[model samples]
Target: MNIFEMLRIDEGLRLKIYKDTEGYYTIGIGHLLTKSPSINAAKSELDKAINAAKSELDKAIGANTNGVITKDEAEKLFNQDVDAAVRGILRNAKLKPVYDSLDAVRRAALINMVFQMGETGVAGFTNSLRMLQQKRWDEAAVNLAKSRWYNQTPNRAKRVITTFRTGTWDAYKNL
Candidate 1:
């Protein structure tokens, strides 16, 4: 079963899970989130989320790996390589002038968002990215608010904005 199906989370809740702060999906073992009664009901739910995240990441890596393997069917194979290609596109953007000053957390969050939303959605936030680079905290906060992902929950946007402002993972302490 899909992770969301196994966890009994509806679409809305799954979106919540995706947008959570603290990079919860990467905390594979002994995570505090999994210690909660609600989250621990099925240990396999955490496993599924971890696997799904890994699978997506692996697909992204594989897409880039095959970028220039010139085989007779390279063009045809390209259709099956969307994830890695998309990751490459995003990586190229990371090397652009605009992303130079981003710290590690912000960089990770931005890439994660891009991985989830695609280039168009990420590109639409040019002003937001600019605001973040400039450290215009409130403007940056408003910029994230403009994205469709912001509609997932107030906490989602707030968590990101708080981290941007404070420059620490402690923003998730109370969430």
Candidate 2:
């Protein structure tokens, strides 16, 4: 139940482009187009890939194939995304201390959050961040649950909160 597996289950795998819950173009394990530096760096290549995929798409009718990416490419991007997310968490002045004090599972939970919403988005939860830093699990969970993030993605939020409370990967292990 490492961070990668946890995020893989939460994000779900896709080898082709599809609409995310928020209606944004997403691929692989929750890689949002608007935020993907990998995609931006190779936009022309991806455009060519999508055009190539369109021809193959007709063979698999009803499957959304606005674009296609190999498992190898998706895994490469996912690893880089995870590394960037870890760096983002470590670089945050407000979160650095909290992140340092937490154990692996808790730290992974924060990384998972960063993967979904970015470091700035996680930092926006000032009160929750404070509670987390203080090691007040219940209060932190409650505070985090009050956000629109919880409303928008209740299941993922619940698993993260559960991980925070239990200090274990049980929330994601079975999945």
Candidate 3:
């Protein structure tokens, strides 16, 4: 068998998180991780494998070791991605003004949401963007709740909504 096949056997295709020999987090088909992680969500093997196959299947699509990408590299890329995404989100005056009014944490939240949603997806919220430009955060929050994104991940939506409204990390109160 080729190396990939053999590693597939020895490493085994585990469409979920587990600790490897040295105890670092590992997942699907030897997608060795640098951080500790737990699998408590739902997804198909296909989705998981596809997810696993990302950044030189992550540290690469791009780092070394089970923690393939160095911590320094990860931070650099994260900041770079944030800068690019935040700029993209701010390109339109609608979102730009709201970005202007927001504090650092809130600004980062919006940037992350925009990045996660993709420029096109965020653009789809034309009305909400308008309300955001008016600084009607409550209205914007309501608009977001009425969206498929809220339905897709209600808990995450709640935390984001909470943060947008009050800038509190209360969601982590129990943990």
Candidate 4:
């Protein structure tokens, strides 16, 4: 029901390195070790961890084992990502008022969206955001269903839209 639990299900954790839907080298609940906003830092503990992960990945020749992360590392990144998503949602001037008015479950749906697609991607849902801001849940869900996000990740989008429409934690429970 919580955001973390919701994302853990939506994103599906994997301690070992694996390719995501877009074929990016991902790990630890969809963390991208080799993409924009790279987690790599020179001489940092994360950098070392990434190095180990990469070495294992190379040795395994793209196998999903050997290159792995501790749950601690995964949790750390997950928390950071969650915060980033929250900040992104709050920082949008137009969306801020809409976000402020939503219940916790609906807010988490926005967080889930920003988590999956980034702020800019979610910002493109103009009509959906407007409908959401107006508290027209069904209209909002319908607008969301028309997006490429719905096409790309129908199951997750369905859950999020349902959460938005229902304003309940039911969609996120037990996952």
Candidate 5:
């Protein structure tokens, strides 16, 4: 299956997933960065974020010269980069609960959103993640209502979030 199918992206996104390596593809962090018509800009952002991530990973793993990490070795490193990017934005925005308790679907959605929008958006939704973390269902719902994703296709968000949240066998399959 194509990456969008794997990620469950909807028609509205107008996204394109690039094959980064064998058995791996990425739509980039920027595609979801802005709810804009220019998918190209988002693609650019994804390129930047992925490059930044590769650089960071290389530095950490002592592969700086080549910036090459095999697909087999990328899960941990990629997750770290994604998580660090998410946490840094969340912390700067002061959104507590750290997205630590949400279901995989929800966490992935939030991570994708944060990766795109950066700290401002996270700050904007500070109370939502906090409420979700606290199990304040009503409050969390209200906060989520105020989020940008509220208006987007829930199924698409669900797809990405589910992958991150569950690490399900299917998450990496057919991509």
Candidate 6:
């Protein structure tokens, strides 16, 4: 083509979302961040958070007054908790983007670790979360290795860390 036609073609170069000099998001398509559109069922304040937590716990233990859920009942309850766990992971915005990008094995590794650690324990690995989101898989695995958790359960933690590094679920397959 002639120089003028080539220059004209270059003038309207728009393909994806970007910011112009004036600072506004322009969108069409460019590898969008891998995020799942989900909900944030969070309380606006501390008092509301505490109240909701208590109510949920109360709802779980209803009619069992001074006793416990039987093993048979507990198994069913555990299944329900697992479902909630998956839902909780999906609902997390910070995690949702990276979580959406992980394959089944990698995703299971994350969920399994969370299940074993509980929310507070998994929460302690904040840096590892950021690493994973950044796709720094090697660093993510190393982060898990240095934790007190690995010191506490070397064998299990080794498997978890290896999975994080290798992006495979072989360790969990036997179980």
Best by lDDT: 2
lDDT string for model 1 (135-171, tens) is 7867787678866577755554565566666666554
The local distance difference test score of each candidate is 0.46, 0.80, 0.56, 0.79, 0.48, 0.53
Estimate, for each residue in 8-100, the C-alpha lDDT of model 2 and write its tens digit. Answer: 999988988766676555777877663222445586865555554454443333344456877876787699889999998889998788889
Distance from true location, Cα of 57 in model 6, Å: 11
Compute the lDDT of residue 131 as modeled in candidate 4. 92
Q: How many times do residue backbones clash in model 2?
A: 0
| TM-score on alpha carbons, each prediction | 0.45, 0.81, 0.55, 0.79, 0.40, 0.54
Which pairs of residues collide in model 5? Answer: 33-116, 104-165, 105-161, 105-162
| Cα lDDT for residue 23, candidate 6 | 28
How far off is model 6, as Cα RMSD?
Answer: 22.0
Task: Give residue 93's error in model 4 in angstroms.
Answer: 1.9
| TM-score computed on alpha carbons, candidate 4 | 0.79
Model 5 shows how many backbone clashes? 4
Q: What is the alpha-carbon lDDT for the whole of candidate 5?
A: 0.48
In candidate 3, position 88 carries an lDDT of: 85
**Scored by Cα lDDT, where does model 6 land?**
0.53
What tens-digit string does per-residue lDDT give for candidate 3 at 20-112?
654345555444444333354345643454444342325543422332444355444445555667778778655677678777656655664
What ranking of all candidate models by TM-score puts the best one first? 2, 4, 3, 6, 1, 5
Q: After superposition on all CA atoms, how large is the RMSD of candidate 3?
A: 12.4
Candidate 5 residue-wise lDDT at 70: 49
Candidate 4 RMSD to the correct structure? 7.7
User: Clash pairs of candidate 1?
Assistant: 63-84
Stretches off by above 4 angstroms in model 5 are 1-83, 87-93, 100-109, 158-175
**Order of models, best lDDT first:** 2, 4, 3, 6, 5, 1
lDDT (tens digit, per residue) of candidate 6 on 15-37: 33233322222211111112221
**What local lDDT does model 5 show for residue 22?**
20
- Residue 10 accuracy (lDDT) in model 4: 92
Tell me the tens digit of each residue's lDDT in model 4 across 1-175. 6888998899998878876665456778766655312344545765555666576445434444456777876787789889988998889876677789898989999989888888888887888888998899999999899988899889889999999999998877766
